[PDB]
């Protein structure tokens, strides 16, 4: 109708008043629909306890990097002078994204203002000056507890006699790699004349997200020699000095200490996806670990057994599920192959439910500390050895594999400690229902998918998305069409893939016209009982082409706004250009 013709129509969905059930949580009935409702409620509450215990530590680390950074910047912003006294202090914040709040100290009988500047707040030099002096007059006349001045450096000249305090303005350029440096060095030149006023103290703070050889290549050399008077650098990045990856991954183990385990493939996938992204890694760490936890409690019924009170709700289907673990198969093969007691394996094979039901609850008192010993290796490398360039994720990966000694000899600094820093752990039976893992490609398919490859796969093959049927063909309208005829927009792509770079739309139409059935669609087209217009065009002696051009032009103008087809030669639109290739 006409409601999908206007943008942003808000819609209130009306609702039935109540259904009076427990359907207030999304956790479905697992074990092919055999689970109890109280176990689903306990699973939801247990997942929320785990998720809250994780994120209450993640938030303290994330709100502690700001209390570390404000402590860092505000120490080399102050407590130092230069003998020239006609220079501005300059701090290059390397690798920093513009997300930090800066605090300026008391320093009484002197104002301290912070003038944040942006590539949107700087289209030329005069808007920078008007915004800077506007922020100066605002943060000077509102921090005092009346005339109108002009917003230029004259306010900086007579700031001493307008207010009575000395000025100390601290500039702050947010995306220094995104401003014009031609506007920025003009602003620095325009600021340089403020030196002669004896009550100012300009400080510049550059938030650079690239290296320093790309800022002093684009600036002019006189501005660079002015900036070489009192400059300091400061590396602000959460990959330098692995302290905040060794506090998010450390805190993830404090929630899963004994209840859950991590796989080998999972930690190497974490390391592969944390290394292909540098700007934000404290967020791509947490949104992989939480989505690993969310795909666990939604899938694994045995999560209800990670609390040692729910041990008595072992139904028959839990005993069916746990029995077909291959580590238990390895254990039972062990009980066969070393010695032969008959009537114990005959019990625990398929008959006795009580022995297997009480046997599994012994397997939860075990700890086998991977994450209980890895903190000892972390404390040994940080305190006793004083090496602060190690990664807890990669050390944990090698400790999980077992080649930890190679990673400890990667430094060649702890040769007398390769026995003290050694730990060879084994597997405990029934790990493979209690492990966070990725062997199905779930964290790949729904966090970092091959987007274009999935679109092209669904366009080309299309049988992995559309079903085939064997009963619903006679009550339908097209029963014999789903088996002999590919879907248009999925059939045209088979000709689009094996075409050239320049595709003539008439040849692209003829190749589509002779891959359709002729003697089927001329029978099919007369099926409709209601309308009468669709049958008279079948009484026309050129029905097949006039039904073929409709489907072809529909598929072409459907590909075009998807991105696979560029119509070159405007005012012709006859020779299209293939512009997406499969497999790339």
């Amino acid at each position: 109708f006409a409601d999908a013709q206007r943008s942003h129509y808000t819609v209130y969905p009306s609702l039935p008043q109540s259904n009076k059930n427990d359907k207030h949580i999304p956790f479905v009935k697992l074990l092919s629909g055999k689970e109890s409702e109280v176990n689903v409620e306990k699973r939801w509450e247990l997942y929320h306890q785990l998720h809250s215990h994780f994120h209450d530590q993640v938030d303290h680390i994330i709100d502690n990097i700001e209390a570390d950074l404000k402590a860092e910047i505000s120490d080399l912003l102050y407590s130092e002078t230069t003998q020239k006294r006609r220079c501005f202090n300059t701090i290059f914040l390397l690798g920093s994204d513009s997300t930090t709040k800066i605090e300026l100290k008391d320093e009484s009988s002197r104002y301290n203002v912070l003038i944040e500047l942006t590539p949107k707040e700087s289209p030329n030099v005069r808007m920078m000056l008007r915004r800077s002096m506007y922020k100066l007059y605002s943060a000077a006349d509102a921090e005092e507890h009346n005339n109108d001045v002009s917003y230029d450096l004259s306010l900086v000249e007579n700031f001493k006699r307008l207010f009575g305090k000395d000025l100390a303005m601290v500039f702050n350029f947010k995306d220094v790699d995104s401003i014009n440096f031609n506007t920025l060095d003009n602003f620095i030149i325009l600021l340089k004349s403020a030196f002669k006023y004896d009550h100012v103290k300009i400080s510049l703070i550059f938030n650079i997200n690239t290296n320093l050889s790309n800022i002093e290549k684009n600036l002019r050399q006189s501005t660079i020699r002015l900036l070489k008077r009192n400059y300091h650098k400061l590396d602000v990045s959460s990959n330098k000095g692995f302290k905040y990856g060794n506090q998010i991954f450390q805190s993830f183990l404090d929630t899963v200490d004994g209840k859950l385990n991590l796989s080998d493939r999972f930690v190497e996938f974490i390391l592969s996806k944390m290394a292909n992204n540098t700007n934000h890694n404290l967020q791509l760490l947490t949104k992989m670990l939480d989505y690993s936890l969310m795909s666990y409690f939604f899938q694994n019924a045995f999560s209800v057994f990670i609390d040692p009170v729910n041990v008595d709700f072992l139904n028959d289907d839990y005993l069916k599920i746990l029995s077909r673990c291959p580590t238990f198969m390895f254990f039972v093969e062990g009980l066969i192959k070393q010695h032969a007691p008959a009537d114990e394996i005959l019990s625990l094979l398929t008959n006795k439910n009580r022995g297997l039901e009480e046997f599994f609850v012994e397997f939860l008192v075990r700890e086998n500390p991977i994450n209980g010993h890895a903190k000892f290796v972390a404390r040994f490398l940080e305190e006793e050895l004083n090496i602060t360039n190690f990664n807890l994720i990669e050390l944990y990966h090698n400790l999980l594999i077992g080649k930890l000694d190679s990673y400890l000899d990667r430094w060649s600094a702890c040769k007398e400690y390769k026995d003290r820093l050694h730990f060879e752990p084994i597997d405990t039976i029934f790990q493979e229902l209690f492990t966070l893992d990725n062997r199905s490609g779930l964290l790949t398919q729904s966090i970092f998918p091959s987007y274009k490859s999935n679109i092209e796969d669904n366009l080309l093959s299309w049988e992995q998305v559309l079903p085939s049927l064997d009963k619903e063909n006679y009550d339908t309208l097209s029963g014999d069409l789903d088996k002999i005829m590919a879907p248009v927009l999925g059939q045209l792509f088979k000709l689009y893939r094996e075409a050239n770079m320049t595709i003539n739309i008439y040849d692209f139409y003829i190749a589509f016209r002779e891959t359709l059935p002729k003697e089927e669609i001329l029978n099919f087209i007369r099926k409709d009982p209601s309308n009468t217009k669709l049958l008279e065009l079948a009484e026309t002696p050129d029905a097949f082409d006039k039904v073929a051009l409709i489907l072809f032009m529909q598929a072409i103008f459907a590909f075009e706004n998807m991105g696979l087809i560029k119509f070159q030669s405007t005012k012709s639109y006859d020779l299209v250009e293939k512009c997406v290739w499969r497999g790339i």
Partner: protein
């Protein structure tokens, strides 16, 4: 047959099919010799073939992916945004998911319903100032004061930043479900709209349920946009005939 390509589609399929073809080997055939139709014959056979070619397999597919809905509600209520890419129209999926399923389940669980702001982003008349006008009466936030507004700044982006720092001291319940159809459409792929919709997804109290159509879509979002969205991607390609949106675009002869 009409392509002499040694390789097919990889990087060497790109390098191989980009050759140079002579003037006599070319086929300069205008599409005038295609048998012309009327507008109403197209309009008739189109709506016939939409719901009468693969109708029961597509309904079977929608019932297959319709038991996926509790995972979508779980991912929304745990903080993520959703992104539904795929072949075909994702329109009726989000009209049958967000209106029917989602907001009744959200409204019951925190105990009228939860307001659903649909946003037809395939319409090129999609300004962000009237869309943010439509957001600021479904939430009604505070106004921009004199100290918090700046010298000729953007009031929409500053208001969303003020809402972001307001909603860190609040209970975490969904207050709106923002349903964007064709998020990479011709008037919403631009930068300030995406800055708006990326700063809205920072708020936990609004669930973004987006959909894309173009294939080079993920390069609209850098390390700041793709971090404030924190999308989870779901290929729900269901081969829909996509006839709500094609009335907007040119169907010129």
């Amino acid at each position: 047959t009409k392509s002499a390509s040694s390789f097919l589609d990889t990087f060497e399929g790109y390098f191989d099919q980009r050759k140079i073809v002579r003037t006599n080997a070319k086929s300069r055939h205008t599409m005038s010799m295609a048998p012309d139709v009327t507008r109403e014959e197209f309009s008739l056979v189109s709506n016939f073939f939409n719901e009468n070619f693969q109708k029961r397999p597509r309904q079977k597919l929608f019932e297959i992916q319709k038991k996926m809905f509790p995972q979508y509600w779980f991912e929304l209520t745990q903080g993520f945004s959703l992104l539904f890419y795929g072949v075909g129209s994702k329109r009726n999926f989000l009209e049958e998911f967000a209106i029917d399923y989602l907001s009744p389940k959200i409204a019951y669980s925190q105990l009228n319903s939860i307001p659903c702001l649909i946003l037809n982003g395939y319409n090129p008349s999609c300004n962000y100032r009237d869309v943010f006008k439509e957001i600021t009466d479904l939430l009604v936030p505070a106004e921009l004061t004199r100290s918090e507004t700046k010298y000729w700044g953007n009031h929409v982006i500053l208001q969303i930043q003020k809402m972001i720092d307001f909603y860190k001291n609040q209970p975490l319940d969904i207050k709106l479900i923002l349903v964007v159809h064709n998020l990479d459409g011709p008037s919403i792929r631009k930068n300030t709209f995406q800055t708006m919709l990326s700063f809205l997804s920072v708020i936990r109290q609004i669930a973004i349920v987006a959909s894309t159509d173009h294939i080079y879509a993920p390069l609209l979002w850098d390390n700041m946009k793709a971090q404030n969205y924190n999308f989870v991607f779901h290929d729900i390609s269901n081969f829909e005939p996509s006839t709500v949106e094609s009335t907007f675009q040119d169907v010129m002869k």
